[model samples]
Structure formats: C-alpha cells, structure tokens
Target chain A: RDCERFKFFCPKCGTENIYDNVFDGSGLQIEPGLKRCSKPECDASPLDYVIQVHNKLLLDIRRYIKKYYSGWLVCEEKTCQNRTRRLPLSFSRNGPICQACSKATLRSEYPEKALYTQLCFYRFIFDWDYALEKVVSEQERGHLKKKLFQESENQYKKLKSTVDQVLSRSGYSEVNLSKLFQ
Target chain B: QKYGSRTNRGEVVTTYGELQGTTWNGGSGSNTNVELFTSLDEPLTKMYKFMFQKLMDIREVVSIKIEELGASLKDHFQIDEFTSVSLPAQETVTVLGQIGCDSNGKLNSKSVILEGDREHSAGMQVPVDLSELKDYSLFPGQVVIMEGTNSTGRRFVPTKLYEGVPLPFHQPSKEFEECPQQMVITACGPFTTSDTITYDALKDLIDIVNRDRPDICILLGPFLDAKHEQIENLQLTVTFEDVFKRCLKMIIEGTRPSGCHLVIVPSLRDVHHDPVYPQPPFSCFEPAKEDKERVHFVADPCTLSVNGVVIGMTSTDLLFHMGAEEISSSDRFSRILRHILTQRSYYPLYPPNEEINIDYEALYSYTPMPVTPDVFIVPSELRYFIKDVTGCICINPGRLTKGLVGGTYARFLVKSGAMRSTCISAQVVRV
Candidate 1:
C-alpha cells in the first residue's frame, strides 16, 4: 500500500520528490531516515498524504417513480371498463385518437404502475418488526446511529427501485439493484 | 248581795247569795296612783292571757322577717363587682364569673362565681333569663362568662350572651338541651373494636347539634391515630384521607349549609413524616380553589377568629414526644407551617392587618423568601423556620431530645405578654 502512488511536493525546496520503500506502517510514512527533501540543502523531512475510502449507505427515491411508467397510452380499453371516454384527437393535435387521454402523460407507462402502487400500500399492512431483529442496543451514540441507519434504509429503497426499473425496461428480467454498483 | 242577784223589771224572786262590790286602792301623793277591780269571768281571763302571749310571739316573728329582708336586699344591690366605660348605652354585655379547675371541686376551690356591687347604674347583674346559658349546659343556671376581667374584679364574658330579651330564670325544656359553644370533639388514639361505638357517639352528637346550627364548629386534636408506634401495631389504620372524608361527610349531610367553616387543629398522632400526604391531619378541599388555600395547615400553634371571636389552637403532643432540642433543630415542620401561614389566605379573617405576599418566581428558583405572619409550628421532628420581612433560616436538630422542648413549651408563652394581645391555643395528642 505504501508504494501504490504518490504526487509529492516539498515546500522547503519547492520541488516534487519520489521514493520507493521509503516509509513504514503500510503507507507513505514521514520519518527522519526514510527520505529527505529533493533540495540539496533542504533539511525538511518527507511527509505522507493518504486518501481513505469507506462503505456508506445511500438511497435514491426517484428510481422507483421511473420504473412504474412505460411509454404507452394506458386507457380503459385494456382494462375493459370504459374505453370510449377518451377524448378525440383534433386537427391541431399531432397524435392518434385514444379512448382515454390526459393533459400530461407519462413518457413510459407500464402495467406494473398499478401493481407497484398496490404493493407500496400493502407493505405497511403487516408487522415488519416480527420478521426482523428490532433490538435497540445500549450505546452512548445509539440515538445518532439509529438516525443514520434510517437514512441509509430510505437511500437503499431509492437505489433499489431505480436500478430495478432501468433493468426491467431494458428487457432484462434477472437484473438486480446490486449490479448497478459494479 | 241580794240586790246583785235581783232580776230586771218586776221579777223580784232571788236566791239568797251575797252581792260583792269592786274594791279600789289609791296612793296619797303628788303623783297619785289608783287601782280599781270588778268581778271578771274565769274563762274570759284565761283567754286574755293566751291572746297576749300570741301577740308577743307575732311581734318577734315580724322582727326576724324584717332583718332577713334587709340582708337579701343588700345582697342584691351590693356592688361587689362593677365596670364603668363609655360604651354605647343599652348595649348587651355579657357578665362572666372566673372559674378555675384543680384536682378537687369545692366552694373555695377556684370556682367561677358572679360578683357584684350593692349599687351601680350597670351593676354586675344578669337578667333572670337563662337563654344565654343554653349553649353551656355544663353550667346550667350559671351565668355566662367572658375572657377578660372588669374594673371591679368582674369579668366581661362574651358580649353575644345578652343579645335577647330578659326573662325570668326557668329550667330548659326537654327540647332545649344545653350544648358547648365551639365544642372540640375528636376521635383519636388506638382504634379498637369499640371504635365503632365512639364513631356512633360522635355521629349522634353531630346530628343533634346540626338541628340547631352553631355559629362555629371546631374539630381539634388528632382526628386520626397515625403515630409510628400505633402504625407498627396496626391499630391506627385510618389514613388522613379517611378521617377527612368522614368529617366532610358529617358536615355536608347534617348541616343546613353546603359547607361548614370548621377550625381543625392537628396533633402529633395525625402529622405524618411523608410529604406526599397533606401537611395537617385535617383539611377542607371544597372551600378554596387550591388545596393550600382552603385548608390552612399550621404545623405551629395558631390563633384564628370564628364568628368574630378569637380562637387559639396548638398541638403539644409533638413537642413532648420529640423534645425541644429536636423540634428547634429541624426546619421541615416549621417551614410547612410557615408556608401555610405566609402562603395561605386563611389568616385574613383574624388580625387582618398582617398580609403576606409570596414571590412565586423566587420560590420556583429554589430561593425561599422570609415566611411572614411570624409564628412557630412545632412538630415531633425538628422542622421549623423563623422568618421575617428580612430573610429565612432553616433549622433542624437531630433526635427527639431536650432542646426541642423550649419551642414546644414556649407556645403558651404568647398568652402572657410574650405576644401582644394575641390569643393562643394548643392541642396535644398521645402518639
């Protein structure tokens, strides 16, 4: 890890320095004997600058809204209740006449729209805590941690819906939200 | 002698009996005395002698009667006791006799007797009427007594006694039984199976008195037995709430008025160590908007007026039990009383001059101000605070020892010049 990469700058000598096996503790280490400044008379020791990456939970709710709609004229004709109620197309309109129409229509309307709405409504019906371990731990920062956990959960829902909708519209049934990360 | 026996008119026949003439005796001197005699009947002479003796006896009896009448008149008019003041004329004033109690009852044994002078405009005299004596059945035919002594050693009793017409003294009818004015009837001590009997008696008395509503009703002393010792024994099971409810029920049910303005003095057996319970053993919730406002809880001995007359009440049981040292040392009991006196508005009826205003914000900030209406309420534990307009200091000493005795015993000290013209009363209970 220590030799991975470095774009170093030495303020004392006003120059960029490079070295190999020059530090300890698995990263660029600044020690008296490890490396000296590039300037001939500079006495300043070299320093290490490290970038750290960690796992974080994120949710994007917009993804779910896109998945429920597909590009289609969803009228009562398909449901077979009242199709003739659709407005007639005028000479100024540049679209085919439909049995039903609205002022603003979805760019992509899918049959799963009604199903997603139903699923969202029914999801809160049962006791969710029964299937999950809902034990609250005793910690000094438990309240703050619980807040963060709830935020991550909402982020996961947004991301899950977005990935699922994009994959389903592209005609991939087995595509999951996890593939989006790669 | 023959001539004396001669018949009147022409009848000359006569028995041969000698006729006698009366003899006369006369003294020959410048102051002459003469005597004459005539033949008198023997029966008539004996009758004269008996009549003369009877006349002399009658004269002696009349003389004795005259002497007795003179003495009676003197007793009635004698001014043995008299008071003279520029009071409104015809104002009904009560004449009182001083009564003291000791071990035995005797004539000279400190008794309350009516004294009067032989002559005065308003002499120490009570109308022959016994209406004023109706309330004091304990002393039937006795004069009504007041609290203060008069100029000539006579006492002016409560002025309300002479409010009605004067009538001759007569025994009260069966319907008019005597009752004590401002009587203190309490139910205290260990509760036994016989407590029901006591309660019944008290209920009966209350019912009877309620028929003729009194001006004031005072329920003094321990209304409940809540001593630690008794609590341990479980004999005193009644809580303060129980006694309060019972009392309120009694008043509400029997009295004509919806609520009775009652003066209750709590005793050691009634006061509890817990703050959750009401401070005083007895209290009224209906009278004031707040519990503290309606029921003026005094841990100290206090004086209040009922029906325009001053009433003093105190409790000595705690002082005796805890001793002066412990009572003086503790500030809790005293502070409770102080809070009541300074914070409660009940004292306005008596001595209206003293008004107390509390800064609520200061109290909320945990900074207690001085407790006004300067008084000490002694408790079994040392809980008292002495405060004035200046500041307050809380004092609490440990254990029921000798130090607490001063504050407790000093309660009565107000009666004798310790406090100015203030009436003091005390209540004691065996805890």
Candidate 2:
C-alpha cells in the first residue's frame, strides 16, 4: 500500500531510484513517494513514476539491488567513466549532477573566473566551486578574495588585475575587485 | 568490563565433537604465529590472471571439471576400465560420469542422468535408473563411478556407486610438531546494525580481542555491506570507500596492542571491494611498518598455516547456495559440507548461484583446494555451526550483527599434533 516495490524511473530523465523502507531521524519511515529524484538534474515528482498499484514487472528484489543498489553510483554521462559513491544533490535546480563532471562543467561555465577549477580538479579542492558560486551571487566579495589569496597570492593578484582593468575601462573604478574587497 | 571470568562473559551455547578445556590467551601463553603459506600464490600481491571470461570459457571449465573429477575417481577406485555411458553394453560395466538432472526442474531420484566424461563418450548423457540401488545420495554437480548395465544405451542401471575422496591434509614437518598451541577467533560481518551504521558489534568484538587475546583473529568481510539497509537506501553521508577505510583503520589501530595476527578476508558483498569470485584481498590501505608482520590481508577462499594448522576460509556463503540447490535426503548441512570436501573446490556448484559472478578461467587456478585443510572456515548466511566433515573441522562463524541484535563468532584452540581434530576445541558464542 505504501509503494512496496519502491523503484521508480524519472519520466523526464529516465534515471531509476529505489527506496528500501528505512526509518528516518523522526522515527518514521520517510514516504518514498515524497523523496526527490536521485539524479541531480531530474526534478520529476514521484507521482509521475511510482507504480501506485500492483506493478508485476518488479517482483524480484535481487534484480532491484543489482541494478539500482549496486553500492556505487556510476555517472550516466556518455563516455564519462566517473564512478563514485557521493550522489551530490543539485544546488541550482538543474537536477542531480555528477559531482565529477558538474565541477568540470562549472570550470567551463566560468572559464575566466575559475581558472583554478581546471588546475585543481584532481587535487580535490572541494570548496572552490562554492567560492566561485559566491562570485556569481555578488555577496561576500572579501571572503572569496581571501580564499583566492590562500590558493596563492600570485594567482589572486592576476585575477584582481583582470577585474580591475574591466571596471576601469567601463569608467566604474568604484567596482574593482580590490576596491570591493577593501 | 570483567576480565577475570571468561565463563561469565558468554557461555558456549552449542558445541560439536569433544571438548578439551585447554586455556590460552593470545600470545601470553606461547609465541605461536600465523603465516600465509608462501608456496601457494599470494592473492594479495598477484593480480587475477583471467579477469574477463567468456560464456564458452565457463562451458569449457564445467566440462573439464567433469573430466578431471572422473579421472581422479577412476584413480581412487582403481578402476581398470570404463564403458561409455552412451554406448550400448551387453553385460555389466563401470561407467564414470557426472550426475545431472534430465529436466530443468529440481533433481529427483527418477530424473537422474549420468553424463559421461568427454574422453569416454564425447559428453553424452544417459538416463540413470536408481530403483535398483537401495541407498544413494546424488546432486547435480557430483562426479561418480557407477557400476551398471545399459543394454539400450538409453537407460543405465547403476548397481555400485563410488564418490570422490578428499585430498590429504598438509603433513606437518618435525618442527611443526614442536610448535606451541594456538587460539583462533573468527567472525564474519555486516558488523554494524541494520538501521544504523555504527559498528557497535565490531567495537565489542575488538574489546573481546583486547581482553582475551587469541593467537590469530580471522575477520571475514562485507565490512561495509552493499546489502545493508542504510547503504542500500544511500543514506550514508560519506563515500563507501572512506567508511571502509575508517573501519579498517579502527580495526588495525584498535588491535595494535593485542599482538595477535589479524587475517582479513573479503567478500563480494563488500561494496568498496571488487565484486567477483576469486576476489582479491583489501589492498587500499597499507598498515604501518611495525604492524606489517602482524597484519595479513588474505583473499577470500584462501588457505593459511597458523601455528602449523592449515586453515581454509572463504567469505562467500557456500552453505546457503548449496542448500538451495542440493537434492539430498540425508542430513542437509553435513552432506553439503562433505560435497565441498569431496568435490575439493571452495565453490563446487556448477553454474554457480546467480548472485556470484564467477570467473571460470581464474577459478581453476584459485578456487580448487590445494589440499584438504585441517580447519575450514566458510562463513555463511545459514545458521552458525561447527562440524567434522571428513576429519576437517569446518566452522561457520555467523555474522557479527544480525538485523537489530548481536550475532555470534567462533573461538577454537588448536594444539600441535598429528591429529589436530582430536585435540582441537571450538565453540560459537554470542558477540
């Protein structure tokens, strides 16, 4: 009655997710239907996918475990052989993004702003994206600038110079990386 | 924490065979040690030779095992000759073949078929007539020598049946007899409880190891089980690899002062490990220089010599697999145990359980028992037991945590002797 099969395919993205009835911190089973799509990029509601009535196709729990619960989340991206356990939730509404490739995409999205994303991809600087995300929101310029300085003072100076030149050319000298952080 | 009374801590709920009240705590009593038999290939260092195998490769392994087992049976029974099971015989004849079922359904006494080995009959199967025999126990994968008459070549009436003999135990050298007595503690995993990821049961086991220091501690894995409810739900915040590393670190660092050699065997259910039969040992973490000698990372289904006692162990649940498939009317568990010993393979079931991803090519090299071990530790999902299967002391130490409650582990003492089975004492106690 409570969606016993618990496996569903996101109609929008075709990413399959399964729930094996576990009690949460509230001492109640989290309604499997209320959960978000496992894929970071797919925001499809459970109503679109869940087999509310009897669905005879999924009688075997073994097959369910083998396919969806094989203990590793492989990136569905074609030619991207990134396999990891971290199923990072979507921060921006695009859906559940592959942590590996999304960070790689964030590098391409702000190529000029996040030069270090490409440089430190394998070095595993986890918070570099969060810092660049701050730059996009136009808040706490001083904190991000301090983070860049710790990455290296030389690179920080180079980034500061580019922003300062762009603002100076626009006759808005008040809006420089240096002046804002100061 | 009461250290003085071992009896009050946990009583042995079930015992098998004789009970010898010999007491020894870890290395305090003697300096006996656990060492991997270097003569056999060390799975920790060696890469699996045949990782990727084909379906045809599996077919070839199955047919070849039939032939090999038939040949060994021929040698054991001293059979001068064999009549092809497929060929028409005018008189009585001895036929060597593997027992198989005629139908896809479960094997019955009526549905029994004897398929001749490749050398004798090009692998042709003949319907077996078991009505003539008074008593017999046969399973699909068992290789047998049948003395029978087959006038039509369609039906074989087997009168006499001969089963395969177990390989001899490792003969100890002069110095091996001089080796001191040893105590072994073995446990399998799902170490954490079902609802949560806290390793409370494993912590308690570590405390037991510290209190009653066994000479050797054999820990079989599924350390971070892929099948665990929390893991299956993907509720864990940390990566499976990191959590497994933390568990290993806890065990290694926790047992550092005990001075007991730790033997860690991995299972296919270990989410962080390679999911395959003939699985490799945990290779991600390297122990400290001082801890290197005490720590042994052994492959599943590995054989080791601990204080001259050859112990064979596999984390894969063979009992449950065979129990589901075997068609024997006799004592169920013992027959399965005998099948493993006589078959002389860790996983003798052909077309192995669907869950097991067996690499047939690697199997011939890795899965066959080098020699019958003095002690065989096959951890299973089945009930925990200690049985004497053909002189070999076979033990199934149940998982550490079973659902919401604590499970059990095995502790046994083995003294150096010609017949270690007679002197060894073991028990399954609550963890």
Candidate 3:
C-alpha cells in the first residue's frame, strides 16, 4: 500500500524522521502520527508531521480509466442543478474534484489541498447524491441515507441466523470462519 | 290518557232536517270508508320475506346449472382412446382432413384424401379411432375442422384428439368400467380483416360448443388481429393491450356459466402484426409488457401448466414468415422446451436457496402432486418433430382465406395421422 521512498517529515525542524516516525496508511487521514523528529535541534513531535508522499498510483489509475472510458463528472453544489456532463480525459481537470470546482465554487480558501477531498471519495458521493437528488435537499439525503443504513444493518442481523443455517448445512463451521475474518 | 269524557253515551242526537228523512245523505255520491289498522304491517312484512326466499331459491338453482354445465363440458372432452383403461376417457387425436358432411351425414370422400404436391404435402389425412372416446354427453356429433396450408401448401393436422365417448356403453369384461373424466376444448381465431366469413364461421362454431357446454374450454386466439381495421377504433381510446384484456374478460364471463377451466394462448396476429388483409404496413415482434401478462405469451415457444398439466404452446404463423432456414437452424424452440420441462419442478422452491439440497426421495414423498398430462402443442411445420412423442397435440385453428379451402385441406391431414391412433379436432369457421 506504500512506496519505498515515502518518508514522514517534520515541518518545524525540517528534519527527516527515520525510526519511530510513520504516516497513517488509511487514505482518510490527511496526516498520521507515530513519527517524531530524532534530531535534538528540532522540537517537532509526531503531531507536527505532515504527509509528504508524492506517489500517485491511485490517482494515475483513476486518470487512465477516465481517459479511455469517458466517465461522468458529478456536481458538488447542494442547491445547484444536479447535472452530469461528459468531459474529455485530455482536459487538465478531468477528475471529479476538478470537475466539481469548474462547475461550482471552490468553498475552501486553499484550492489545492481542499480539492483533494472533493476529487476523491466526497466528490464521487456528491455526484451520486446529485444524480438522485430532486427537489429534496442535502438534509433529506443525509436522513434517507441514515435510514437506509440502519434498515440494512437490521435486516442483515435478522438474516444472519438463516445464513448460518445454510452455511452449516454446507459443511462450514461458524466458529472457525468467524475468528478467521476477525 | 285522553280527556274526551265518557258522558256521551246517554244522548241520541239527530240532525239534518230533524227527523223528516234518514240522517245520512244517501244521494248519488259514491260511498267511501277509510280503515286504519296497525296490524296490517305484519302481513306485508311476511309477504316481502316470502318473495325474497323464493328469489334466493331460484338463484341457487341457476348456480347449480352453471356448475353442472362446466363440469359436464369438461367431462365431455376428456381423452379416452389411448389410455389403457376400460372406462372411456378424454382422448385428443391428430386432425386428418376437413371433410364436409353431405345431406346424408357422410364425409365427402374426395375432400378426405386431398393431398398437396409440395415437398411437404399441402394436406395429408390421418385416421383416429374413437372406440374408447369419453364425454360424448358434452358435445353433439359434429366434426371440428382445423384449416391452414403451410408455405409448402401443407395443411395443419392435429397429433391427437380427446374423444368424448359415453361410459355406460363400455363392456363389463373390461378392467375399467367407469369413465369419470370429461374434456372440452375452446377454439377462437386468426382474427383478420376482410375475413368476415371466417369470423362468422367461428361464431357459429362457438355457438355449437357453448350449447353443449364441454368440460374444459381452451381459447387459443380470441382477440381481433392487430392487422385488422377494427384496431383503429380500439386505438382511439384504448391500446391494443386493452383490447385483448376486454376480449379475455368477455370470454371468462361467457364461459363462467359453463364452469369450464379456460386456457388462452396469444398469437402474433392477435397482438403485434396487422391482419392478413389490406396488407400490413409494418410488423413488430416486441410485445407490450402489460399484454404479455394478460395472455399467456409463451414467448416464441414455451409451455405452461393448466390444472397442474403441462401444455406446450408454439406459433407457426410467425415461423412461416421467418422462413424455413431460420426455423430449422435456430435452437430457440428446443431450448425453451428443455427449460419448461427441467425448471417446472424447481419453481416452487425458489427464494429459499437453503431448501434446495433436500433429498429427492423425501421431497417427492412429501409433495402433493397433480396429474401432469404429457401433451405438446406444435405448429403444422413442426409436426415432423412430434412423431417421437406419443401424447402430443396439434393446436392449429386453421388459416383464414377465400372460401374454406384451407379448412377443407386441414381436415384431410388429420385423417391420415389417424392411422397412428392419433385424434384431430378441426378448428373451423362455423358457417
């Protein structure tokens, strides 16, 4: 999930931390801490570290697929018309973040960093939301989503026993597989 | 409670010119008397109750007749010939030819043997033996003539017919003596424009069958063909889909009195294609989803269950237009047949995948099963493929053309197949 050259850096001391310092592997975090500046001259700790990894494998894969497939770009504005327009891969801002920014306003003062969230997961969900949204507002969408999630969870829980029965009949023991997945 | 005093009994008062004449005027006026009685309502109530009771009794009698008609009709058409029972039962036979009955009630011999010259003969005659026929009580002795000539001019023929012979006539030496099954088949059209004669003929046939009230009524194609001019009027407010719905509704109502089980099959001309007259400007194959549900579309070739019995349905009219090469080469027909036979048992156990692994022996013993008659309905061209099967039936209602030439030829083919002990029923125009 990571590249070899990727390193955690401390902004205060501008020191490269090798041992004890590490970045969070989950894509959700902007920066993860474990790494501290080892140099005595630097007073930076793990919390002061910022992500400096430059590898873009995930980004590149999305770009390549978009370039060939003519994928759809979603809108991000909650109140704006939920419209999807086809954009060429060759366009500089072909991704969702860039597409959203072009169609809507850049709410964040800092465009580059703020665009990351819009371009990745948030952007895709927004597009999905826009496609489904009619006269209903974002508040309603959030409520419906929560309701559906709860319903699905309850249904799955109720059906778990039935699934177990089928699994047992198929010669599978629940105890072993449960621990394996955990 | 009234205070009108009881003191008036002692005085005899007289008026009207004193005692000169009678006190009451008896001059030329008509006498009038109003009798007010509180007890009169009781008898009126009793009268109303009596009338209501009589009405209910009449209604009960009518209901019984309807049920009896339906049962009798079904019993009348049950297959009797092929089954290895001494008692008469319904036997469906292949149709041979459409021979006209002369004034003497004999078949026209020339029409009985008519044959076509094409690679597939225009007509071939088959003879069906009705010695074990059952349910003759449901129908008068009248031959049903199926008509239509294939591209090769080959007339369509039935593979079997369920003859309705009476049960009491059976010999006592036989192992089976009672024939309890009844058979009734309902036939309707290839509704076409410029075919008023055909429509009239069909009406006549329906009249005959209804009068007898067979046991089961199977409506093959009851609606007007889409190719007819009548569709324009239907389209003004209702779609072609609605027309079929109305037709089925009417048929259900008409046959309800007969209490017959109804099986209906949709035809291409009945839904999508224009009638064979005035020339169809366009033709379509995709049936509307709504119409698909109302009538048993049967896809291009499929089978359905009626009272737990499998009845295979295929349309040759479309196949004929599709050309022989396509019909022969395409595996669509065969695949549909396989699907129907294999998946029929599994339909009940769906959605609960866990129950699929039960032992076949245990499941078979526990399940309540209906008697599934192994019968296949095939077109005239596909009749060749049916020779391997013994219980198949042909469902050709015949073609609508000038005169009854097609109808005449179709009957001949059935006679020819009758030698194989297959019975054929002619679906002819009534006139």
Candidate 4:
C-alpha cells in the first residue's frame, strides 16, 4: 500500500529516490514534518532529514493546485456564476492537464509522478547537509547524488552546475547528471 | 452504415442517432445537420425587459405555441377540422390545441384552448369543454388532439386525444426473438467517497464488474462530482479534468479484466466537462488502444442501440425536476416517467430545476429523444423501481453511490426481440 504512496525510497526497501513533493492530497504529512521511512525494511536514517525538507516543498506546490488553481479555474461557459467548475486535478493519465483554468485538486489522484515533482527534484541541490554533516550512509548518500543528478542531467540542466558543486563538496566526482531513469 | 436516415416504409424500419450522437461506429457520429428547436435557440433579446411586455411576450409565445400545437396535431393526426369557435355539434369532432388556464391561471378540464391568429381563425384560441372524455393525460403547454363536437362554441368537448406518436420501437436488424442472456450492468458515479478521492468505491465496483463479467457495462457520472464535500470545499490538488481523467482511466484499466464493453455518459455535476444539461460526453484525449475499442463515451440523455435494442438514458436526476414544479396527480413515479414520454425530450422542463445550467442551444441540439427507447434508464436519488410508461420500460437503477458509501449497481438481461413488455429483466445489486 505504501509502495507508491510514499516517495521516501530506501530501495533497500524500494530503490534510490530523489523526488516527491508534499502531495497532501493523500498523506497526512505536514508541519508535523521530517518523516522517516515508516517501512520496516531498509530502516532509514535518523538524520536522513534530506527527504523531510523536500516533502514540505512538495506539499506547498500541491497546496496551490488545490487552494488556487484547480477549484478557481472553471469553465467560463456563460455569465452564469453557478456554472459547474471542473474537477481540477494535479495529475492524471488521461485528458489535458488544464492550466489558467487549472483547477488542481489534492487527490494525488494519478499514480504517476506529477510535472512539478520532476522539476523540483531537478532543482534540488542535495549538498553535504553541512548543518548536520549528516552521518550519511555511504549508500544513502550515493542514491541521493545519483537520483538528484539524474534529474538534473535529464531535465534540470539549467541548474546542473549548482548541483554539480554540491555533489563535489560531498566528495563525489560525478561530473554530470546521468541519463539514467530509463 | 447503410441506413443513415432512410428506411423504406416496408424495409423493416429502425434507426440510430436521429436526435443525438451514437457510439455504434467507433463513436461520435450524430445525425447530420441536427438543429435545435428554434424557439429556444436564438437569444431572447425581446423578452429581457419590460415586465408588462414580458407577460405580453409570454402570452404571445404561449398562444402561438398552443396554436402551432393544434395545427400540427390537426395536420399530423388528420382527425377532423379544428375550430376556433365551433360549438360542440352532436357529431364527433376533434379539436387540436393545448391545455390552458382560462381564468385564474389554473388549468382544469374546464380550460383547454385552441389557439389562432384571430378570434375566429384556427389559430385563435377558445376554451374547450372536456366534459366528455374517457381518459387523458395533460398539463398546461401540452399539445394534444381533443375529440368531440362544439355545436355551441362555448367549449369543445373531447372523446379521445392523441399524444404525439412515439418513435417506433426497434425492429431488430435481424430477429433473435429469444437470444441468449446478454448481461448489461449499469453504475453511476461519484465513484469516490465524500472524504477522499481514493476511488475506494470505484475500486470495489471494478472488482465486482470483473467478478460478474457482464457483457455491456454502462457507467454514468459525476466523476469528481462538483458537489462532493471536498469538492465544494475546494479541497483538491489535481485539476477537475485530471480527477475525471484519473477516475476514468482507473475505471478503464480496472474494468479491463471483465472484458465487458463500457458506455460512459456524462453528468452536469462532472467538473471536467462543461456543466450543461444535454451535457456532451467526456472527451478522452489519449486512451490506450485496447481501451478505446470497448469504451463508448456518449452524451447525456443519449439513445444508444446496443445490438439492435434501443436504450435511452440521461445521467441527470430527472426526478429532481419532474416533481419540483409538477401539477399532475398521477402516480408521480409513473407520472414523472410519463412526463418525459409525452414531452419527447430527455428533459422537457423549462429553466432546468436547479443547479443545472442549460445551454438551450446545446440542449436543443443534444437532448431530444430520437426514438422511444425500448429501455429508458433514469438515474435517481431514490431507488426507483423499473417502471413502464407507454410501452417503454423506464428503469431507475438507483445510484451506485449514496451520500458517502458504495450503494448499488443495476444489472439487466435482455432478449432483444421479446415483445416490449416481456424482453427485459433487471435487478439492482449492492455494490
């Protein structure tokens, strides 16, 4: 159930994961933030707070498709204010993902990743958690670097240098993002 | 394909999509050059102002409409010459006209009018004396044929009346009078629960369809219902269209296991689609190949011919309107069913009851009932029984979802050629 539900990958439990916005459409995660992998498998780090930070940002974006765009955007069929507004949603595998009239919802309705999720991960510069100098697992650290870098190389190229430097500080010489999701 | 609009009188006549679109040929083929009733089609600029003029206009409209109704009845039925002021002559006379309130705006058998261009022309209206009729069904604005003589011209009495002819029942493309059981399951949506968009209810419904393996499954919508608690509260993360698409896709994918064909009709409450009565079907942008073959997205209030059996349905809860302004005393359940039959449109009420935005142009173009369906499915907030109104089996399979939980889905077994009263059997099962 929590398989696709949670984005916190301990691929030891699932796989290396670099993305997930706070999709409150489903989860109860919030200001009560900084969550650990609840799955018993691949027990997560006490300081693997890297994902906790990312989740909040994700939450905020999802909040708009709900708070502003999805519901507010409606079919201007006529002057009738009571005209039925469409069920604006954040994601779907069907129909156009509407905009302007982008009445986005909180369902996390689609099983697949949303467009913003990819964008956010691409810009996320996972650095040396300098504040905590996280006792990051050599393994956990490797997945974040790879997943984050792959997002950068694949689509977030504009921010690649920043991510590259961040990775260098963590002692990885990986020069460019990998074209790896495939 | 052979008969788009023609059927030689003796050529075993049957039709598809005369008034609305049909899903027969991979979908989206409506009757060519379909037109809306002109009276409601054009913008009402003249009636927009002047309370005094508005009533005059309404009077003009109603008078003209009643006159036209009589003229058509006279011409179509060819019963007898209509009279503007003919007194009931002892001979059997038939007057074509409408039921109207002659006094305090209350219509009774005492006030039937034959409208006309003058006080004496066939278009001039005069109250009718219906003191002598066997039986009748009518409401104001109803067009009908009144049979009886008016020798005194005070009022015309009536014997028999002709409700407009219903479109003929389907003459099977080929006779299979006793065909094997064809299972058709129907489910309406709000497929999700009120609290979450998880589609837990839909998930259960799909599992049921898969388990039962019905032949043709009909689904109606409010998929991402605009009125859902969360929806009204504006608490969603996806676009309304996305929720619909997502719910629709899941239904598509989930029902794949059942291998049954799917027919989905839209509801005004569906957020992704335009909120208009005679609402058009949800348009899917890119459906997976196999799913496209079996899924038929049709307009609301559509008449579909499935394997030669004409089935009509509208996703709107007509019961919500049929009784709101009704002045009838008939068994309302049956009366409600009868109202649409006589009116000949999926929704015959004017200024749709409430919460329904009617694009009269769209409605006129899409809402007329092409032929009297052998099976007319009416979804309701109540678990209405399958009823028969003028040779048609009107079934209200109830709803698949209630306020918050999974309710029931209707199932049907039809032997396409069995006589009107005998061919179909239906049951509503809990979801």
Whose DockQ is greatest here?
Answer: 2
Off by over 4 Å in 2: A1-182, B1-9, B16-24, B28-30, B38-45, B49-51, B418-423
lDDT of 3 by residue, B118-171 (tens): 112122222222223231111111122222222222223222332322111101
All candidates' chain B TM-scores are: 0.27, 0.91, 0.33, 0.71
lDDT of 3 at B141: 14
Instruction: Report how far residue B338 has shifted in candidate 1, in Å.
Output: 23
How accurate locally is residue B117 in candidate 1, as Cα lDDT from 0 to 100?
A: 20
**Which 10 consecutive residues of model 1 chain B have the lowest summed lDDT?**
B43-52
Model 1 alpha-carbon miss at residue B272, Å: 6.9
> Model 2: how far is B247 from its true place, Å?
0.9
True contacts kept of each: 0.00, 0.00, 0.00, 0.00
Q: After superposition, how far is residue A85 of candidate 3 from its true place, in Å?
A: 34
DockQ pick, better of 1 and 2:
2
**Model 4 misplaced regions, further than 4 Å:** A1-182, B1-77, B83-136, B147-165, B175-179, B419-422
The sequence of per-residue lDDT tens digits that candidate 1 reaches over residues A1-182 is 21112224554455665432222222122221113566768876542211000000001112222222211333333433322211121111333223223332212233344434433322221112311223222332233234423533343344234324323322212445697787
Rank the candidate models, highest DockQ first: 2, 4, 3, 1
Given candidate 4, what's the lDDT at residue B325? 45
The TM-scores, one per candidate, come to 0.22, 0.69, 0.27, 0.54
For residue A8, give model 3's deviation from the true position in Å.
72
Candidate 1 positional error at B277, Å: 13
Q: Which candidate, 2 or 3, would have the higher DockQ against the true structure? A: 2
lDDT order, best first, reads: 2, 4, 3, 1
